[PDB]
Amino acid sequence: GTKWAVLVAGSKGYGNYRHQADVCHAYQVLKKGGLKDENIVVFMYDDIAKSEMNPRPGIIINSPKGEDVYAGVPKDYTGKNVTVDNLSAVLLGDRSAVKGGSGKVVDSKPEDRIFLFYSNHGGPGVLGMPNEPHLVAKDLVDVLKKKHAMGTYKEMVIYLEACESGSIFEGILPEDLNIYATTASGAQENSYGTYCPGTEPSPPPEYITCLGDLYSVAWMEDSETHNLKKESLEQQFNKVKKRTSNGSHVMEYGSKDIKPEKVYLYLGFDPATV
């Protein structure tokens, strides 16, 4: 089977640098794991690398002495094309329903695995998008229920960075869709930036905004430094939960039978981590 990923930054503006830095970094992790560009669909408003406010033009970093994570990232859905309608079409593998953007979609097969990562603002039962309208959790779950009805994936893992992010799935994500999801925070709780001015470890002084989000960099920095053939989703969740409590409470939803699976089945494996 093929590994697919959909990476979504739900916000825009330089003050939200971190959500797009998280998504660019996630792309780098998946590329090191051997996922192909044709199978990684990126949604990012794309106003950060060339931002009038960026002190390192053309570069995005997601930790204080990190490498540039912007170089190489596909521009599938950027600017006004970062929409709920396009995200739905993409997840459902329906290029005819896409309006604007590259036309890349998750035209996946029953044997394929899918990883979804979202980073931005959240509210009760709702996720931000940088264009109107926002993404209502019930509508996202309805897209996932439809994808399941279509039969076009084997298992799916969703990592979700937002305030009140548990509220995206609590009470509404069924446990029998072969979808396991974790979230940065509880249903009525805030989630946090990391690498922020004024709290060590802090970013370089040219940055007046956080470089990343704690739950997001927790899984990414863990993934790029461990052999993912040997680490399970359960071990990753435990490590991410521990790092994020610092904090907020990382929650899990859906098919908990997926937890003992090795992470490389979703994120790939980097030979350098042996």
Residue numbers in the entry: 58 to 303, 310 to 337
Please share excerpts from the published article on this structure:
Asparaginyl endopeptidases (AEPs) are a group of asparagine/aspartic acid (Asx) specific proteases that have been classified as belonging to the C13 family of cysteine proteases based on the presence of a His-Gly-spacer-Ala-Cys motif. First described in plants as vacuolar processing enzymes based on their propensity for processing seed proteins stored in vacuoles, AEPs have since been described in a variety of organisms and shown to be involved in a wide range of processes including, cell death antigen processing and hemoglobin degradation. The recent discovery that evolutionarily distinct plant families have repeatedly recruited AEPs to catalyze the formation of ribosomally synthesized and post-translationally modified peptides (RiPPs), through the macrocyclization of linear precursor sequences, has caught the attention of drug designers keen to overcome the current inefficiencies in native chemical ligation that limit the therapeutic use of cyclic peptides. Herein, we describe the first structure of an active plant AEP; one capable of performing peptide macrocyclization. This AEP, the most abundant AEP of five AEPs in the common sunflower (HaAEP1), displays structural similarity to previously published active AEPs from mammals, with subtle differences at residues involved in substrate recognition.
The crystal structure was solved by molecular replacement yielding a single monomer in the asymmetric unit, and revealed an active monomeric HaAEP1 (residues 58–338 with weak electron density for Asn338) that forms a canonical C13 caspase structure, with a central six-stranded β-sheet region confined by five α-helices. The structure of HaAEP1 lacks the C-terminal cap domain and N-terminal His-Tag, displaying dimensions of approximately 44 Å x 42 Å x 39 Å. We distinguished dual conformations of the catalytic His178 and Cys220 residues which we hypothesize represent conformational changes that occur during catalysis and correspond to substrate free and reaction intermediate states. Close examination of the electron density in the active site of HaAEP1 suggested a small peptide chain is intermittently bound to the intermediate conformation of Cys220. Given AEPs specificity for Asx and the nature of the electron density, we built and refined a tetrahedral complex of a three-residue peptide ligand (AAN) bound to the active site Cys of HaAEP1 with partial occupancy. Residues Ala-Ala were modeled upstream of the P1 Asn due to the weak electron density away from the peptide backbone at these residues.
